């Protein structure tokens, strides 16, 4: 394949040399190349593709939406993964399956790029579904959960922190939980989330309420 | 409107404040008051119902 | 990378200087650059992109759909978050996950 490609390259070089030469050296053959714009189209499409990719790479370098080793994604098209290398033509992304993903540079031209690798906090969200018969303790449970969250060493007190009775559900009364953690590490965030969930379970059990299963009323006949 | 297993009543209003926490607190208070009213008037909230013909 | 980019920039500068110069200074080489419109396309696409983004930013400044620190969204495409900065080319939006979101200015043109 390499030798065939070299042969074709030198054939193209000979063709271009013949085209450059005028009547003094053989015949220019300009009309043949411009017989129907074949040479024009051949040059134009290749140049357009190469220049588009090259300029997209240059703009990527100048704007700096992401760097090597950054976790990125896009709501427009999926490119999720960790950046491995930014070439002049193709950007290599390592997916979370440990598989290469080759993205042409021009695909970044007009899309919104998210950079989770540059996040400042990790969010924790969950819903507590209590039974409809536990409506008398909703306020106390919410207050207890908020107090527990406000005293947790792993929670960031400068970020949003909401715990309120949110909405009626089909078979439960839902309570929203919304907070952030100081750390941005995967394992530490997961451990903090697990600890918070266990504490929430303990609080709910201690206050006399319980979690609601999908309920249903049956009329027998 | 009539539902599959309940009679639905719509609630539609606005709050003076535009703050997230204050709006959520007002919503929770309104929901608790609605629950109290419904319980006091003798009605109750409907679970997904179903009629079963045994054989 | 910075030094390589500088080298390529000065190479392009030398190329443009050679193109500007006529027969008095070497050869203009205009035909080579216009052999198949390579230079024309290279200038046109870059200029179109840069000008589109710049003019979108200018229109954003003049119309004032939003300001710094404003929660925004769009039913057409998702950009939800709080505006962090409005640059000449890219607008930075902080999502509710506390992650940066870089939106080219031209994406606000028709939505
Ligand atoms: C082994 C034969 C190789 C022949 C390659 C021909 C290449 C033609 C290029 C035409 C470009 C317009
Ligand atoms: C110097 C600025 C370069 C801008 C490059 C834009 C490339 C757009 C390609 C779009 C292909 C669909
Ligand atoms: C070839 C075009 C070069 C454009 C360079 C733009 C540099 C932007 C720097 C922004 C720093 C905040
Ligand atoms: C037709 C224009 C081709 C331009 C190719 C430029 C390649 C630059 C590579 C820089 C080394 C990574
Ligand atoms: C038609 C022009 C082709 C230019 C090829 C550039 C190759 C650059 C390789 C950079 C490796 C780091
Ligand atoms: C280290 C080698 C760098 C070579 C850079 C070549 C840049 C070519 C620009 C062509 C623009 C049409
Ligand atoms: C002074 C008015 C500037 C208007 C800029 C419009 C840019 C449109 C870009 C569309 C790209 C798809
Ligand atoms: C370059 C074009 C400038 C257009 C300026 C429009 C100003 C609109 C002001 C509207 C105020 C209500
Ligand atoms: C080819 C036209 C380029 C125009 C670039 C204008 C850049 C203005 C920046 C203003 C400072 C924030
Ligand atoms: C090709 C023209 C490039 C113009 C680059 C403008 C850079 C403006 C930076 C403004 C920072 C506040």
Numbering used by the authors:
A (entry chain G): 114 to 334
B (entry chain A): 280 to 334
C (entry chain A): 114 to 224
What do the paper's sentences say?
However, higher concentrations of DDM throughout the purification, which is sufficient to open MscS21, also stabilised the majority of YnaI channels in the open state. Open WT-YnaI channels with an overall resolution of 2.3 Å, and the overall structure of open YnaIA155V were indistinguishable. The most prominent feature of open YnaI is the diminishing of the kink at Gly160, which separates the pore helices TM3a and 3b. In addition, on the periplasmic side the helix TM3a kinks outwards at Gly149-Gly150, resulting in a wide-open pore. Compared to closed YnaI, conductance is enabled by an increase in the pore diameter from ~9 Å to 22 Å in open YnaI and a rearrangement of the side chains. In the open state, the pore is wider and shorter than in the closed state – the effective pore length is reduced from ~35 Å to ~20 Å. The diameter of the periplasmic side of the TM part increases from 67 Å in the closed state to 90 Å in the open state while the diameter at the cytosolic side remains unchanged. In the maps of the open channel, we resolved six alkyl chains per pocket. One of the alkyl chain densities enters the vestibule close to Lys161 via the pockets in the open conformation. It intercalates between two adjacent pore helices and stabilises the larger pore diameter.
